[PDB]
């Protein structure tokens, strides 16, 4: 078992100020792979004291100095990628095919998103176009606070640390304390890049501790979390008697509109998407809307597709799907289907219990539903597991008014092979992404939803300025 | 007495649900000139429920049309332009020579910089530049929730409801109850515009119950809030568990940092923007940090000054200041000044009670306080009464310090001949605007600050973006 109890705070890997153990649980088998420490107010307090002594020398470090720290980030953590991929594949249960290619390789896209970005971007430019008086400045936004998730953990930390660093913020993170090991790694990547003394700080801890206190701190001026979209509120609660800068992301109940027309292979792909990371997306295609000539059809393709979905271990090699990441998580997803067994919608695959053969590990069946009505929790609340919700519409109105019923809008999703259609879709629909056929938003775009997904925009030029405040200088 | 108790819903003035009277008081007599009605949380509902089902249909009419719309309120406006000054003048006191040219003025200003960069805007952009694929899509943020204050009412409103009617927002605006009448007749001229049922609605109210409501009614999408940094708080508070967008304008402790080598009128436009609209502005430079050489200068230009300033009612003619807006403003004006004497700043000239031979009113001297240090309520402490605090500086480095010394961070004012030197001050101190040598932000910037003085972008192309949520589409 790994002893993990440090923090990284001011440079240096130290003991929290009193032992509070936590076991890191290996969910593809149910044991302890790691002992970690929950931090208490004294701990955040040093890493925040540490993070605004170095903010005083850090803000004046040219753009120049900190894209080649970012460089040289990323250099290591190539270096490091397979170790990041066994770590996230044992701490949380990725496949390790998918914990290297999707789990590691997308924090190295951000990384190279941001480069991108920041060689775009100018700290000055003009405040009003062809007005050579007036100039608007970038600043450093301050001391933050970062807060991260279990499900895509490196994703999830490289769109929050590397545009604060290119900022010229310094920061305070803590990571998920059931998936923490690949932030800590993280931490050793920063710490062999030789980034300064107290840029950057990790502390593990809790939500009701350590991530209220943070949201609270008077010396922080902005927290970028991302999660679940309770704890969001809560966050935005504790962080108003301080007026912070307050981004979220957070969960989701994404649509996918099916037509008729859709190409070939628009179901499987949608199936897929639904069960990829055992389904533990914020943005994940969980409600399918497909029109009623292919409704049939569309049944029938779940069912092949969840039949033929395998589930195993995190350490083993291939496509199968690994277990959810905890027992409160299982416990969760078991409810919500038996919940819709029990409200009358058509249960065509899978269902309760663990997969037949699998003795322990945190399994879930894929699972496919069919005729889900609106009032239905299996419609309503975000599952996070495999588990995917199929209903018909009739009209282009009856599907927008479905993928419309929710209070979260992180990405829907539309396929139809008619250009015209998807357009008019597209524009209806209330979120802040849309993937039409299968296609993926470019590097450099944002992610980010609107309402109970939150209004973050993490990602390139966009993310980079969350992390900035703007300054308007009537006479340059 | 004018009986100015209705609401504007749907179209229409009518009644509260319960009689609420609550007299709008004349600050340059202190007699009661209008009643109105405070409405409660039914009267709020039935607004809502307005802008709600005209958001349906308001949100499908086209740029053109709204801009047209627009253009008629801007055209009402300047017919109606001497009855807001008139109406201004009596219910907060603004002398109505300024009552006309720049409180009613700037609202005029405001549209017409609104309908400028109406016309530079696209509903519908590139996502990434050089890519036909993917697309940016703007999408009415919703139903808001629009709250004004008394000091600036038509700059603040026209603000506020100009761009939620461009982006095709619905809305709900609550003004001060202390100077509700210019929004109302700002609700007329909406009206004669002829803008369609339910789209615009007024209430009026209070914050510990309207106000509050509004911002955590779960029919309103974002609330606009322009006031008091510690009603901000509770606006962000009570937002926080329906996620609101919340866009905050708050107070200000403006530095106005002056070199030896600022131009010869320097110091005069200093003392003078100080004490102008009586203090009563969020951004009004009240700290003016005097390089030691110029000191004694200083004093004495302030000196002379502020006994060349006249007070007088609102309802008379010439550039005299008016009084502050209440007893309750005027209270704790007095007690701050009184506070200024006790903490040993020296008094230099004004200080506590009324001018000599005003009888009623709430006439606050204007006052001078020198040698005032950082500890001081009248450093610290935002008082928004004819108040002005001096003291000097010896180096770069301390007038910086001296700068940021605060919380807030609204404007900042530079004054000095040395384009570097006005480059290098800019460029450190924290706040969201900077004047340097009385040079004002250009038409169509935006207005807005940072930290405790919130982080709001309005006017041009900001305001309308707030108003907008972004939606990224993989494929149009
Ligand atoms: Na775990
Ligand atoms: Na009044």
């Known amino acids: 078992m790994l002893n993990k109890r440090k923090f990284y705070i001011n440079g240096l890997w130290d003991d929290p100020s009193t032992p509070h153990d936590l076991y890191v649980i290996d969910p593809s088998t149910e044991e302890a792979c790691a002992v970690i420490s929950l931090g208490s107010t004294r701990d955040a307090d040093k890493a925040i004291n540490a993070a605004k002594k170095a903010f005083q020398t850090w803000k004046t470090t040219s753009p120049h100095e900190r894209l080649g720290f970012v460089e040289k ?26 914990a290297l290619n999707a789990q590691t390789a997308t924090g190295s896209s951000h990384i190279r998103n941001f480069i991108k970005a920041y060689k ?5 430019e003009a405040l009003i176009e062809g007005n050579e008086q007036a100039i608007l400045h970038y600043d450093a936004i301050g001391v933050v606070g970062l807060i991260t998730p279990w499900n895509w953990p490196m994703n999830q930390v490289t769109l929050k640390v590397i545009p604060a660093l290119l900022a010229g913020c310094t920061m305070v993170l803590k990571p998920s304390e059931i998936a923490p090991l690949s932030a800590m790694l993280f931490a050793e990547i920063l710490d062999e890049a030789a980034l ?39 966050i935005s609660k504790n962080a108003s008697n301080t007026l912070k ?58 069912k092949d597709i969840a039949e033929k979905t395998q589930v195993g271990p995190g350490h083993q090699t291939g496509n199968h799907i690994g277990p959810v990441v905890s027992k409160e998580q299982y416990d969760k997803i078991q ?18 219990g663990l997969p037949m053969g699998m003795e322990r590990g945190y399994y879930v069946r894929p699972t496919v539903f069919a005729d889900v009505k609106p009032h239905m929790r299996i419609f309503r609340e975000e ?30 999703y539309i396929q139809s092979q008619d250009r015209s259609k998807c357009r008019r879709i597209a524009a209806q629909v209330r979120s802040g992404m849309v993937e039409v056929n299968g296609h993926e938003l ?34 340059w």
Chains 1, 2 share one sequence.
């Open 73 to 98: 980030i990323l250099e290591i953590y190539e270096k490091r990628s397979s170790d990041m991929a066994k770590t996230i594949s044992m701490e949380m249960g990725a496949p390790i095919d998918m």
């Open 120 to 124: 775009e971007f100018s700290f000055q």
């Open 196 to 234: 300064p003394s107290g840029v950057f700080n990790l502390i593990n801890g809790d939500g009701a501790n350590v991530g209220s206190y943070l949201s609270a701190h008077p010396d922080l001026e902005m927290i970028s979390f991302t999660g679940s979209t309770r704890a969001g509120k809560d």
């Open 245 to 302: 800068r307050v981004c979220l992301e957070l969960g989701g109940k994404g649509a996918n509109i099916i037509f008729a027309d859709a190409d070939i292979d628009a179901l499987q792909r949608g199936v897929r998407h639904c069960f990829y990371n055992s389904g533990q997306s914020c943005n994940a295609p969980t409600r399918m809307l497909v029109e009623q000539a292919i409704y049939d059809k569309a049944i029938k393709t779940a």
């Open 335 to 352: 409810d919500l289907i038996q919940s819709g067994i029990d409200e009358g919608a058509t249960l065509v695959t899978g269902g309760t």
């Open 383 to 412: 599952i996070f597991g495999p588990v995917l919700s199929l209903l018909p519409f009739n009209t282009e109105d009856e599907a927008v008014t479905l993928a419309n019923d929710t209070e979260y809008g992180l990405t829907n």
């Open 442 to 475: 470019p590097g450099g775009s944002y992610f980010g939803g609107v309402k109970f997904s939150g209004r973050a925009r993490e990602g390139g030029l966009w993310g980079i300025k969350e992390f900035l405040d703007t300054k308007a200088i009537s006479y």
